[PDB]
Design a protein around this ligand. Structure first.
Ligand SMILES: [Ca+2]
Lengths: 368, 388
């Protein structure tokens, strides 16, 4: 019947001819469930949820064993942010039909949105069980795993996804991030480079690639990548602050001062960006306009806590503070404890002169 | 009901002891296949090719179905250099005993050592069907596979041998060389890194690591390597001649100068090293000496294209164009795929107004390295001068 025309207009995005043909039909065969189904679906592609859940309900009132109809209702519920009800409907529709892949996917979605990470992954495994070719779902699953700390399991979904669809940059980039978190630098670089080689316009691939080469200390390469990132997104505030950093390490204290600032303009929040500029100013030869920058950053927030025990409680292994705190504790009869603090400070920062110099005195004030 | 107190001591590495017990064991029981075989293994171990193969002959006269008997006998033939003799003994020993692993292995060596490579490949394969956990035997397969081009296969092997033995250092490095040869700079280095994290004295590991960091132009690191590699092998010439280039690359022209001279010491016949020392001199101004090294380099290797092409440059800069062209032409004869030489000449021609004959070489040097920016600029100019 017009089911042909309907399915046509609907395929052609021409949602109005669709809805027309449908009502026509429905008014002749009030039982055509696939129609009340199509309708529901249509009013959904038109943000018209109420009319969507309405026809979904008509479908059920004509046949309570339609897995799809409870899915559709589940979809109208998820958007209205009504997660419990979305889930409740997805689970039923899956009871009526255990091989309904779309339901498993919708449900995973609502589940994660609702907090249940474990359920979500159980749904993806089911989904993948029935259709191991959905490489995107593999990936999404891999993400949830990574999100939960199961990197090796994540590493597997990604590899499997790549295996299922060799040409799929997202995968490699995600797989590259797993390796990075694992300290497997050369591997991260390899995947990122591969991600990028696959989709040149892959912004984040370029940012991540630059970040690893940065950490690896391979600056020229680290740069070439950051630049290529900025060309794809001239406004990325963080990239600047990082690119600048590679410039300051490379030995261009000037361009750092230049680029560090511009970064701030992009987002006057970057605290690290200010203090980094302060240290860059000290080298340039301007201690005065360096300290203000230090304050500026410092003033913006107590986040870093540089502004002792509390700063220590915040910053683990902050040699500087371990030295400061130790001095006071030492010039207070509590040398024995300061000694342990300096010791720790010197264990943190091998080249902390004042620390060996302070401890030598503390250990000498213990003999007296 | 035999007297086996003889094999106990034998196993300890106490040949004579065994030999003594044995001798008497046969004296009473002149059919000690086990004694004769043990005897032959001993002698062979201690380089007694003649005695070794003698007891073995006996153990065969007695029990002819002794695989290990023919294998030991063949081992001696191989050692002597007689591969045909040794190959049939290994084959027979296998007909008799199919599950005879040392039989397959020993076969592989001799086969490779002879010529058949796919044959020695089979031996390795079967020997692995009987005991898949013999990893050191997996590598050797890959190595053999690699040298045969099939890298994807050899890769499978190294990949597996590591699965079997994760701490199998040589495994890594070797797999590393497959990625490098495949242009997988990042993997190739990643592996070469395990190869050394695991075994910190793995020379070839370092020499391989830096050799690749270098062609990726990651010179600081590539120096940490060769430095290491050289700490393990103080007089390794080739490693000097490569460290030198990494220096020259980072500006330190004087170090490279010394270094290249060191590497030449540890290897008089070292063209490439000369032809590079020259390059170094040529840039420090010492263009006289520079011309001398390229002279030597072309003395040692009358066909050294880079020495050819680079000496022509020095000649073009002395007005010596005709000659500069003879050299540019000799270097293109020794290597028709020489992008550089192709434009270098295409420049001397363009400077003489021989534009058409200059396009010819600029086209041919671009088709040989589509990334040649310089040859693109020049050919751009010539085409213009032909249109004004
Ligand atoms: Ca003209």
């Amino acid at each position: 019947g017009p089911m042909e025309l309907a399915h046509r207009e609907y395929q052609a995005g021409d949602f109005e001819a669709a809805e027309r043909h449908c009502m026509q039909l429905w008014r002749q065969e009030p039982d055509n469930t696939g129609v009340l189904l199509l309708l529901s679906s249509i009013h959904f592609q038109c943000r018209r949820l109420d009319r969507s859940a309405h026809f979904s309900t008509l479908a059920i009132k004509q046949n309570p064993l339609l897995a799809e109809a409870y899915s559709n209702l589940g979809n109208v519920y998820k958007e209205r942010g009504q997660l419990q009800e979305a889930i409740e409907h997805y689970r039923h529709a899956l009871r009526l039909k255990p091989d309904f892949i779309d339901g498993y996917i919708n449900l995973a979605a609502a589940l994660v949105a609702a907090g249940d990470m474990e359920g979500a992954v159980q749904a993806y495994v089911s989904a993948l069980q029935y259709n191991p070719d959905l490489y995107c779902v593999r990936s999404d699953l891999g993400n949830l795993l990574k999100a939960l700390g199961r990197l090796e399991e994540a590493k597997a979904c990604y590899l499997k996804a790549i295996e299922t669809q060799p040409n799929f940059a997202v995968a490699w980039s995600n797989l590259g991030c797993v390796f990075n978190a694992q300290g497997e630098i050369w591997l991260a670089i390899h995947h990122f480079e591969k991600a990028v080689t696959l989709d040149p316009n892959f912004l984040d691939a370029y940012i991540n690639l630059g970040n690893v080469l940065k950490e690896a200390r391979i600056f020229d390469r680290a740069v070439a990548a950051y630049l290529r990132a900025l060309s794809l997104s001239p406004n990325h505030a963080v990239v600047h602050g990082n690119l600048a950093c590679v410039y300051y390490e490379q030995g261009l204290i000037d361009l750092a001062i230049d680029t560090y600032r511009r970064a701030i303009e992009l987002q006057p929040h970057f605290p690290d960006a200010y203090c980094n500029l302060a240290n860059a100013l000290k080298e340039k030869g301007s201690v005065a306009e360096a300290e203000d920058c230090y304050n500026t950053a410092l003033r913006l927030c107590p986040t870093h806590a540089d502004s002792y025990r509390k700063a220590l409680e915040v910053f683990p292994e902050f040699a500087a503070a371990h030295s400061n705190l130790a001095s006071v504790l030492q010039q207070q009869g509590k040398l024995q404890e300061a000694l342990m603090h300096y010791k720790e400070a010197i264990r943190i920062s091998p080249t902390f002169a004042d620390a060996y110099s302070n401890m030598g005195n503390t250990l000498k004030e213990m003999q007296d």
